[PDB]
Amino acid sequence: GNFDLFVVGSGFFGLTIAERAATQLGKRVLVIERRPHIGGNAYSEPEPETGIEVHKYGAHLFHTSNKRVWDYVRQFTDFTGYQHRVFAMHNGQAYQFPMGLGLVSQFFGRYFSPDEARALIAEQASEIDTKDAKNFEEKAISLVGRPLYEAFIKHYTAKQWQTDPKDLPASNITRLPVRYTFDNRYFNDTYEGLPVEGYTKWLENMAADERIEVRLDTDWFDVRDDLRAANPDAPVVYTGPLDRYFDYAEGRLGWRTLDFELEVLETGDFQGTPVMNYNDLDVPYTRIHEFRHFHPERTYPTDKTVIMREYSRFADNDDEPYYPINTEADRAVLAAYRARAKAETASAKVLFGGRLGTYQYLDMHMAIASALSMFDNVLAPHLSEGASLVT
Amino acid sequence: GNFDLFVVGSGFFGLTIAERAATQLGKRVLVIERRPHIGGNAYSEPEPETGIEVHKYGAHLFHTSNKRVWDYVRQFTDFTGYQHRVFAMHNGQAYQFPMGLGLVSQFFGRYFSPDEARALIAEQASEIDTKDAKNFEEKAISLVGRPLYEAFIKHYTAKQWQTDPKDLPASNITRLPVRYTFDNRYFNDTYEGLPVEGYTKWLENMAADERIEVRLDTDWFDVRDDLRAANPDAPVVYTGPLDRYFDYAEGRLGWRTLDFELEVLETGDFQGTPVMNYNDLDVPYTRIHEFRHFHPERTYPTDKTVIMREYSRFADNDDEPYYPINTEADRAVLAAYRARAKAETASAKVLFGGRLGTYQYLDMHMAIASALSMFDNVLAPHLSEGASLVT
Numbered sequence: 001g002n003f004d005l006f007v008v009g010s011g012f013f014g015l016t017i018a019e020r021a022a023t024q025l026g027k028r029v030l031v032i033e034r035r036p037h038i039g040g041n042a043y044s045e046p047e048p049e050t051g052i053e054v055h056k057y058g059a060h061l062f063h064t065s066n067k068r069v070w071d072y073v074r075q076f077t078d079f080t081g082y083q084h085r086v087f088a089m090h091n092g093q094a095y096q097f098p099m100g101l102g103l104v105s106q107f108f109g110r111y112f113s114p115d116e117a118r119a120l121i122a123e124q125a126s127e128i129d130t131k132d133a134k135n136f137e138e139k140a141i142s143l144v145g146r147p148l149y150e151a152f153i154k155h156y157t158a159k160q161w162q163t164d165p166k167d168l169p170a171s172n173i174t175r176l177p178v179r180y181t182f183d184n185r186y187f188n189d190t191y192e193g194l195p196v197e198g199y200t201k202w203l204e205n206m207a208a209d210e211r212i213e214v215r216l217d218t219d220w221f222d223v224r225d226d227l228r229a230a231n232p233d234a235p236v237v238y239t240g241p242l243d244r245y246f247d248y249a250e251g252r253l254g255w256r257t258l259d260f261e262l263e264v265l266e267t268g269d270f271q272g273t274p275v276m277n278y279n280d281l282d283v284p285y286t287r288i289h290e291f292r293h294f295h296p297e298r299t300y301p302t303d304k305t306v307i308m309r310e311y312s313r314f315a316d317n318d319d320e321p322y323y324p325i326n327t328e329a330d331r332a333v334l335a336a337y338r339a340r341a342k343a344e345t346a347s348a349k350v351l352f353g354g355r356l357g358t359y360q361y362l363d364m365h366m367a368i369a370s371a372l373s374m375f376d377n378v379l380a381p382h383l384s385e386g387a388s389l390v391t
Numbered sequence: 392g393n394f395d396l397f398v399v400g401s402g403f404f405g406l407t408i409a410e411r412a413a414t415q416l417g418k419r420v421l422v423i424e425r426r427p428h429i430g431g432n433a434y435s436e437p438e439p440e441t442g443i444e445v446h447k448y449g450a451h452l453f454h455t456s457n458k459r460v461w462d463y464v465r466q467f468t469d470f471t472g473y474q475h476r477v478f479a480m481h482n483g484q485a486y487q488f489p490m491g492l493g494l495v496s497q498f499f500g501r502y503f504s505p506d507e508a509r510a511l512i513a514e515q516a517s518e519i520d521t522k523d524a525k526n527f528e529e530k531a532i533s534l535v536g537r538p539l540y541e542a543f544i545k546h547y548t549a550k551q552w553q554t555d556p557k558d559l560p561a562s563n564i565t566r567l568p569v570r571y572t573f574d575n576r577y578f579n580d581t582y583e584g585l586p587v588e589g590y591t592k593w594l595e596n597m598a599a600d601e602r603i604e605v606r607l608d609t610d611w612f613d614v615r616d617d618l619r620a621a622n623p624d625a626p627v628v629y630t631g632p633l634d635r636y637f638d639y640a641e642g643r644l645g646w647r648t649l650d651f652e653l654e655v656l657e658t659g660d661f662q663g664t665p666v667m668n669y670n671d672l673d674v675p676y677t678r679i680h681e682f683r684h685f686h687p688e689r690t691y692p693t694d695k696t697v698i699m700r701e702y703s704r705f706a707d708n709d710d711e712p713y714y715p716i717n718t719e720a721d722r723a724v725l726a727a728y729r730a731r732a733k734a735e736t737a738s739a740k741v742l743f744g745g746r747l748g749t750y751q752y753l754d755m756h757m758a759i760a761s762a763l764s765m766f767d768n769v770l771a772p773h774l775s776e777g778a779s780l781v782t
């Protein structure tokens with residue numbers, strides 16, 4: 001049939017756009033998705049042996065301080081009262097985390113009060129002067145001191161960035177706070193929780209409107225010419241890779257990827273907490289997720305659990321792209337593609353959005369906020385009142 | 392104590408050198424090995440749950456037509472009568488392999504005699520003229536025809552090389568024979584078998600002589616200065632990476648790596664043969680190894696088996712290097728390092744050998760042949776009669 005709007009990609013950005021067009025302007029929307037499932041990287045699914053919901057592209061924790069977004073998402077799902085907390089494994093011991101009075105007292109072997117901890121860190125971090133810092137390693141030492149740096153930062157950084165911290169620029173550290181309280185709540189956003197029926201149901205609700213069609217297993221580039229010949233005045237919101245859209249004509253944007261190993265174990269509980277960071281070099285993974293703990297309210301089985309080991313890697317051409325590397329070279333490459341994108345927008349009615357469309361890491365709430373904004377300020381005016389898509 | 396000779400690396404090249412020096416010249420040899428085990432990539436070990444011997448760095452099949460090598464290795468191990476055969480999985484069917492009368496009859500649906508098969512291939516391969524071939528894909532079609540190419544070569548090549556076959560040079564295909572008989576013995580060497588007590592015992596026997604010390608978990612670069620200060624007239628045979636030896640001063644040599652996934656299944660037999668190639672794009676691995684079938688003479692358990700999925704990847708800086716990529720750029724980089732190596736040989740008594748030391752893929756028998764030759768023609772003359780190490 002006929003379409004008023006094409007959305008490429010069914011992640012949170014894509015589905016926010018598609019939903020808002022359908023329900024707020026009455027528009028016919030086609031969502032083209034190349035994967036065999038919707039939801040982009042927020043997709044979740046039960047592990048078969050155990051029934052436990054697993055986040056297939058990495059652990060997804062929802063948090064936001066944006067009231068508008070919080071009100072928007074709650075139309076599609078309820079949230080549990082989950083609060084994220086993380087522990088760290090170093091030299092055979094499990095530490096409270098992030099760095100705070102708990103970790104400090106554990107690591108140094110006795111209670112440090114807020115004033116005493118402040119004094120300790122100050123003294124140890126004085127080894128290097130921050131403005132003299134030549135690189136990441138030195139800057140981190142100049143902020144938290146060498147003992148804490150070498151125990152909980154050095155090797156974890158090396159694993160996560162796949163680069164020796166001495167070869168990372170000092171530039172990539174703004175602050176490196178130690179909490180001078182025992183508060184170990186990981187995020188400090190106003191709103192936080194996990195979707196009660198899980199992420200996939202949430203995303204399916206966003207696509208529920210009759211005026212939205214979702215075509216899975218479909219690559220936009222395989223179908224666009226005849227789809228747009230069908231509906232020439234239909235604008236496009238594209239949330240796939242930016243460099244691919246222009247046939248890599250400016251070069252490939254660099255990304256980091258993640259490898260996961262899912263394992264079902266014959267115990268009811270492997271580590272007693274959702275996420276354990278592994279700070280030492282003697283194991284190759286950065287973190288282990290245990291998914292039963294994301295939803296304690298669920299009646300999961302008692303004799304099995306599923307865990308997931310996470311590993312960091314530079315992305316090869318065909319790896320899933322997760323984090324932009326963002327070298328100067330990358331930023332110059334990006335610069336060229338957004339010029340192309342602005343010209344494609346003006347000439348072909350194609351908007352570029354989302355994590356892949358803009359070469360940006362985006363949290364779920366930031367992707368949603370981004371899409372709501374594109375809708376309100378660029379796309380809806382066009383669809384409703386013929387306004388230009390040129391900014 | 393004192394040493395007459397340093398060998399860096401305890402793979403087949405290294406241990407051949409160390410053994411020949413110890414037993415044929417009476418020399419004190421120290422082998423420095425950075426891994427926690429000896430044997431280099433030929434190392435094997437029993438999987439714990441099943442007891443089954445697994446080749447930890449890929450399936451290792453011994454074959455040679457070199458009588459000297461065959462006589463040499465049999466001093467350290469007995470061989471079984473194993474003959475390697477490979478099958479290929481395409482579109483839900485298992486095919487005899489390599490391409491021959493069996494595969495051809497299966498694939499085309501009826502018996503083709505030697506003359507008829509010859510005629511078939513000739514006709515189909517005539518689609519493209521070999522000298523007109525613009526790339527790998529076209530050259531392969533010009534040799535075996537499009538139907539066979541698209542079924543058993545196209546996607547397997549894409550997976551193994553991590554490159555679209557249209558973007559590989561025609562240059563990388565010499566011949567692509569179809570066997571016009573039913574003979575499916577994989578290798579055509581005079582001698583073939585598997586070590587009766589397994590690869591690790593074999594390698595341990597090579598290092599058995601009292602005059603050989605093996606230090607595990609030791610990086611040559613961490614220890615060389617004081618080791619050589621200890622024994623200044625001791626020559627060195629280095630079989631680690633060539634580019635690393637000279638601090639990557641000419642750039643990094645490019646390699647391909649392999650990823651493996653070991654799995655123990657609750658069946659006595661998963662695929663009924665040691666190696667199954669997967670020629671289709673719908674699975675990411677290239678091959679599955681089932682190790683019980685490498686040693687049918689062993690009394691392995693009946694209710695479990697261990698398999699290994701193999702995947703191809705370009706090597707990152709810290710991946711295990713398995714196959715040289717060998718671009719023109721790589722060959723120019725290599726060229727510079729062998730000039731450096733020749734100067735290091737003349738000035739510091741350091742020989743460069745083996746797979747890593749020469750940027751070469753070497754089969755086991757070719758590594759051994761190589762080391763025997765370095766011994767006889769370069770190193771033994773030096774150790775015995777003070778001859779120069781300069782060639």
Ligand SMILES: Cc1cc2nc3c(=O)[nH]c(=O)nc-3n(C[C@H](O)[C@H](O)[C@H](O)COP(=O)(O)OP(=O)(O)OC[C@H]3O[C@@H](n4cnc5c(N)ncnc54)[C@H](O)[C@@H]3O)c2cc1C
Nearest residue numbers: 009011012013034040041058060061220240354355363364
């Ligand atoms: C490991 C990992 C962990 C994360 N953890 C969190 C977290 O804890 N909390 C949080 O708030 N956010 C988290 N995020 C970000 C989260 O996934 C966001 O929902 C995501 O960034 C949403 O942005 P997006 O919709 O633009 O991208 P995506 O979710 O990637 O959606 C893009 C969709 O576009 C499809 N597509 C791409 N190309 C084409 C094409 N040619 N044709 C058709 N379809 C195409 C893709 O298949 C994909 O489905 C995490 C991300 C990752 C990778």
Ligand SMILES: Cc1cc2nc3c(=O)[nH]c(=O)nc-3n(C[C@H](O)[C@H](O)[C@H](O)COP(=O)(O)OP(=O)(O)OC[C@H]3O[C@@H](n4cnc5c(N)ncnc54)[C@H](O)[C@@H]3O)c2cc1C
Nearest residue numbers: 400402403404425431432449451452611631745746754755
């Ligand atoms: C998947 C794979 C499959 C293979 N299959 C076969 C087969 O089927 N049949 C066959 O004949 N051959 C096969 N081979 C080749 C086989 O492994 C050979 O025995 C190997 O090439 C022997 O050559 P080498 O001794 O020079 O290298 P290696 O076996 O790699 O030995 C090198 C040793 O040097 C050590 N080392 C490196 N750097 C240092 C350092 N700075 N300090 C101290 N020690 C160091 C390394 O840890 C390593 O142990 C295969 C190889 C691979 C990767």
Ligand SMILES: [Mg+2]
Nearest residue numbers: 314316705707
């Ligand atoms: Mg890589």
